[PDB]
Amino acid sequence: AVTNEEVNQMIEDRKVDFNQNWYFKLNANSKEAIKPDADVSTWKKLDLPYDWSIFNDFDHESPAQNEGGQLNGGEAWYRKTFKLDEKDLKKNVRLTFDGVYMDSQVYVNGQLVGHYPNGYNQFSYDITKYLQKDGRENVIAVHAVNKQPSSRWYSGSGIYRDVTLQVTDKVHVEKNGTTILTPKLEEQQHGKVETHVTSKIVNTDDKDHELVAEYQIVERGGHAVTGLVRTASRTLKAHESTSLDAILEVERPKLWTVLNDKPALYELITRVYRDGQLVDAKKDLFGYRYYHWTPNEGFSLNGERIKFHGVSLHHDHGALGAEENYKAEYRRLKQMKEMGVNSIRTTHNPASEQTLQIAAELGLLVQEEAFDTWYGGKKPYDYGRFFEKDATHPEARKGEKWSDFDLRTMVERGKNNPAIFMWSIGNEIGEANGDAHSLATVKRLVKVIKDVDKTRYVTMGADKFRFGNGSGGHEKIADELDAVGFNYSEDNYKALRAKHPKWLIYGSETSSATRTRGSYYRPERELKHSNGPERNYEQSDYGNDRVGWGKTATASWTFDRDNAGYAGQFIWTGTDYIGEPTPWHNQNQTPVKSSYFGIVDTAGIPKHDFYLYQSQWVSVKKKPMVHLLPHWNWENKELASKVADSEGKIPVRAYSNASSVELFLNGKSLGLKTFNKKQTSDGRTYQEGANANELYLEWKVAYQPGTLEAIARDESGKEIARDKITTAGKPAAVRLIKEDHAIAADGKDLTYIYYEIVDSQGNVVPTANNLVRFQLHGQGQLVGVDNGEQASRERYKAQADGSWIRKAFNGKGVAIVKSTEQAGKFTLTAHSDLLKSNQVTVFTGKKE
Numbered sequence: 001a002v003t004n005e006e007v008n009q010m011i012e013d014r015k016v017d018f019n020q021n022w023y024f025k026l027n028a029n030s031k032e033a034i035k036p037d038a039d040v041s042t043w044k045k046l047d048l049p050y051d052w053s054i055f056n057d058f059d060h061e062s063p064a065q066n067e068g069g070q071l072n073g074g075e076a077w078y079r080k081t082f083k084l085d086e087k088d089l090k091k092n093v094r095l096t097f098d099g100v101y102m103d104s105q106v107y108v109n110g111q112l113v114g115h116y117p118n119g120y121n122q123f124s125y126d127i128t129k130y131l132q133k134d135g136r137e138n139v140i141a142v143h144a145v146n147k148q149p150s151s152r153w154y155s156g157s158g159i160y161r162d163v164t165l166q167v168t169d170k171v172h173v174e175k176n177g178t179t180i181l182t183p184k185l186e187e188q189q190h191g192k193v194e195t196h197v198t199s200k201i202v203n204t205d206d207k208d209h210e211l212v213a214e215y216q217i218v219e220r221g222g223h224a225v226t227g228l229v230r231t232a233s234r235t236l237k238a239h240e241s242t243s244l245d246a247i248l249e250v251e252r253p254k255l256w257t258v259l260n261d262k263p264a265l266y267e268l269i270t271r272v273y274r275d276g277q278l279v280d281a282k283k284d285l286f287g288y289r290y291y292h293w294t295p296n297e298g299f300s301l302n303g304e305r306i307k308f309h310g311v312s313l314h315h316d317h318g319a320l321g322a323e324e325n326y327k328a329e330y331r332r333l334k335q336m337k338e339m340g341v342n343s344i345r346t347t348h349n350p351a352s353e354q355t356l357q358i359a360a361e362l363g364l365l366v367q368e369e370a371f372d373t374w375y376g377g378k379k380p381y382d383y384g385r386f387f388e389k390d391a392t393h394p395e396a397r398k399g400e401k402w403s404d405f406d407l408r409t410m411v412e413r414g415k416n417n418p419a420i421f422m423w424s425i426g427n428e429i430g431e432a433n434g435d436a437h438s439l440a441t442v443k444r445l446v447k448v449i450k451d452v453d454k455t456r457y458v459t460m461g462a463d464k465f466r467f468g469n470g471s472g473g474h475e476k477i478a479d480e481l482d483a484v485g486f487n488y489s490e491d492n493y494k495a496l497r498a499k500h501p502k503w504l505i506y507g508s509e510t511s512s513a514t515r516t517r518g519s520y521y522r523p524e525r526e527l528k529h530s531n532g533p534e535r536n537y538e539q540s541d542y543g544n545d546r547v548g549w550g551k552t553a554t555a556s557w558t559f560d561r562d563n564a565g566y567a568g569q570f571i572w573t574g575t576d577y578i579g580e581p582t583p584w585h586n587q588n589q590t591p592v593k594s595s596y597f598g599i600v601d602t603a604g605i606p607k608h609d610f611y612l613y614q615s616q617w618v619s620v621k622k623k624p625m626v627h628l629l630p631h632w633n634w635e636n637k638e639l640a641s642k643v644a645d646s647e648g649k650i651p652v653r654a655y656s657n658a659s660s661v662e663l664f665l666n667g668k669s670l671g672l673k674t675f676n677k678k679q680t681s682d683g684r685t686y687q688e689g690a691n692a693n694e695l696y697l698e699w700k701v702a703y704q705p706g707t708l709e710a711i712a713r714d715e716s717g718k719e720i721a722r723d724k725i726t727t728a729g730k731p732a733a734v735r736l737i738k739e740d741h742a743i744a745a746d747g748k749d750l751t752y753i754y755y756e757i758v759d760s761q762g763n764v765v766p767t768a769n770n771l772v773r774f775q776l777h778g779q780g781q782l783v784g785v786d787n788g789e790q791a792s793r794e795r796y797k798a799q800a801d802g803s804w805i806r807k808a809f810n811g812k813g814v815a816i817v818k819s820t821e822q823a824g825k826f827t828l829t830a831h832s833d834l835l836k837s838n839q840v841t842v843f844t845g846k847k848e
């Protein structure tokens, strides 16, 4: 008899991590790459993922230009050899790539399996017929090409996401074969909820077989919530496929939501029987949630009205480059969640598996975006050139173009993930102008999605709405969407809303405020696209710089807050990313190589607007807070002259979700100030400062060195939070700050250790740029160093002599250390010239 234990083992064994033991060579000879018994002594042995570009030096002559981060691409081969276990000799074998950038070719045993242009969409190949008989070694060779320029942001190059192997019986649930629907959830939620499941089953055998599917639903990390539900036994013919169906009932399921930080998730277990023998078993993640959206009230989730407090995110992880990593993406998404973010937009490409899983786990709604261009292109070597070409993937359907195939497979991949609620079929598509070609195209793409999944809003992000009054032919394209995304179009919302009263409208992309951490300039002014030499390649952490087409955090948020019919926004961006260093865009001889748009810097350190947003989006009951800016080191006349008002006072500002804030300088009160409480036209309560354009409270403070302390209080006058800033003396030491006391010894988990330049009393020196040198000992591996400074041209990776160094920027930076597969510990030591050295130790071992 097959025990539940055996079924769970079968599920685990069905899919394996195939990232280990690859060989990499830039510009490798094609014939050596694909052939048996190649000499790999000149190749780099490594474990995936591996983005080769992040290891380059910045290049002012890079064909990527600074928009692409001035890190070159080129072409490379990755090669791996493997053998099937004796028991797996007759099994079906599928190889899945979560992302390869880009224009890839996969070879198995000297033969071309497929060519796949898309740099971000997951793709997979059934490689069974290509493998050797009798368990002799197989060779996989992957060619990746990044011919530049191909991108408006840093892409990275190569196999930058996971590769997995599925080994299954000849009769099996096909790739993305599971559909899970809860069509009557709202009505049924207080009793038995019908859960409609569908399995696409394939018989790859040359014999007919009798087929039965058996299902059970379980709480993820919890218990069973159904028994086994069985389909009627039927024949599945040789080389044929079929869809089996069942309905399971789950009583009073916990509903997945963004309103908590560990939302409920479930798994469907599928057991497949061939002639009465269990041959295939798998699980599929899903959740129970429903939502609704109306023109005038916007969005609701499980009956609760919310706004999308969203961010747009690019894929890179700073010093990790394009390398996707669960722990890195977890840190980032949890950080967005700590801010009050409840949703994300994967701008402008399919998401990794890690991103999608973590969003489901943390409770973040997701818009996953297929395209940055259609047939027009934006950069010569981007996806545009492939968009209407015939798809040559071995599993593409007749007549499918690449755009059809890529969009379909993205949707089929993610259709059960409860976090995804929107599919975007394009961002700022210039050619989508309402002409016959673009109109045909929008309807074709909408239909590709609706044939797979009707439960999610098909959308686009459109900046065309910001020009003039926002009207034009593009309106016909918007009419074909479930929901219309406005990029930077607040100014035309009122008119577009009166014109199109049935549209579901939201800000697909907003703000594009530009900021450098710890840099301050002219807080009394709003600065528009201010990029003169007097700026020193920095933007203001007061949040008063924004691009020509952009808005400040305050202006973009207050508009959203005031308008119920504008359902939310996805801020450009939640974090900085490599490339696009507007407002120095493609000024290639300047130092800049990474973005200013992020609320948080590339090193994972929040800029001040993080706390502005937190004060707006996180309830005083959940996390009472107060945050002061700027720093309190104003000895430097040049720095101070750019900040001080006419009376020479420093504008000190507090963001807080409390009722009042009282500022003290060296223990002396500078006066309690109280937020003005107000209501939106539809009765929503909010707080503001001295006027509608100020969400902070402000004091003009005559500079006296010492301590500024802010006391935040509830309406009854009880202290609920404080913040404080202290004038630092001269650098005296480097201090290391551990995020984790321990991590898993799985060779995948990692940790972020911050370094700070401190004075002799342990105050961070807010202007310090001292060079820090790092040593690592023990069971760890340094994998990155960063300080988030846009103008920096420092390496993120090891120097050419193997050493690891990085300057502080405005007192701070981070070092990233990955675990090995051995338990133990690692010690990070930091040194700096004439300063005291410091070390921390992080343990490695058991997960959880």
Ligand SMILES: OC[C@H]1CNC[C@@H](O)[C@H]1O
Pocket: 152, 347, 348, 428, 487, 509, 512, 547, 572, 580
């Ligand atoms: O302000 C910069 C943004 C404009 N909208 C599209 C984004 O990818 C980015 O270029």
